[PDB]
Design a protein around this ligand. Structure first.
Ligand SMILES: [Cl-]
Ligand SMILES: [Cl-]
Length: 246
């Protein structure tokens, strides 16, 4: 009756074998990198495809880490990032407008470096995530800029990777160092609904970083690698689908 992802079956097996393998010798970041080494050895033992691009951190290191889930420019309007920088941004060294601001869904921003404040609001009925813009007199002057839920879903589908948050014991025996892994929390999915709840809760941030080229034929024009959707790595265990392997 039961079915599951073939790849996930192998990855879980590999992680289960590392955890159940007791003390592992290492030449030591040490806890995570040793885990990465052992996982690499499981590819051969399982004749599995590569378990590459899985980020490995301890709970301790995860708590200090900020993960970018993906980058993505607004769905609407066309040329939104150019409007935002020119209208609401500030002049840089070179006389070109830029907008660099972290925005959340629980509070408005309050930066003294810009003449506008920002908040994310989830328009659940229209299935869009809106950027609200306020002037310093608390007037909400614009909520036209948005990301569709489908666009965000597509980013998640294309860009999400597995992550394992782990812990271990260590010891020294006969001048040699060993780690023994307690467990692994394997993050496997994040839904658009959970993403949007996380923005509302103040746990997921939207990092707008819209620059301008200073020279060349593109001088003065928008330089933007995409608005980044970011979350503390421990915090991701609140929102994601997570398998505990012990
Ligand atoms: Cl070993
Ligand atoms: Cl066990």
């Amino acid at each position: 009756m039961k079915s599951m992802s073939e790849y996930l079956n192998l990855l879980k097996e590999a992680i289960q074998n590392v955890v159940d393998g007791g003390w592992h010798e290492t030449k030591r970041t040490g806890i995570g990198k040793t885990f990465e080494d052992l996982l690499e050895k499981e590819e051969d033992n399982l004749d599995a495809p590569d378990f590459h691009d899985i980020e490995i951190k301890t709970h301790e290191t995860a708590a200090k880490s900020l993960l970018t889930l993906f980058t993505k420019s607004p769905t609407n309007p066309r040329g939104a990032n150019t409007m935002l920088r020119n209208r609401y941004g500030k002049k840089d060294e070179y006389g070109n407008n830029i907008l660099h601001q972290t925005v959340s869904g629980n509070r408005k921003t309050n930066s003294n470096s810009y003449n506008y404040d920002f908040k994310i609001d989830i328009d659940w009925e229209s299935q869009v995530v809106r950027l609200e813009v306020f002037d310093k007199q608390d007037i909400m002057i614009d909520n036209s800029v948005y990301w569709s839920f489908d666009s965000l879903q597509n980013q998640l589908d294309k860009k999400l990777k597995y992550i394992a948050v782990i812990s271990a014991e260590s010891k020294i025996e006969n001048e040699k160092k060993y780690y023994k892994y307690n467990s692994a929390n394997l993050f496997t999915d994040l839904t658009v609904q959970s993403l949007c709840r996380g923005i509302e809760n103040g746990d997921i941030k939207v990092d707008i970083r819209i620059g301008a080229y200073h020279s060349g034929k593109k001088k003065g024009k928008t330089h933007d690698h995409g608005t980044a959707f970011r979350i503390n790595m421990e915090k991701l265990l609140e929102y994601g689908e997570v398998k505990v392997i012990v």
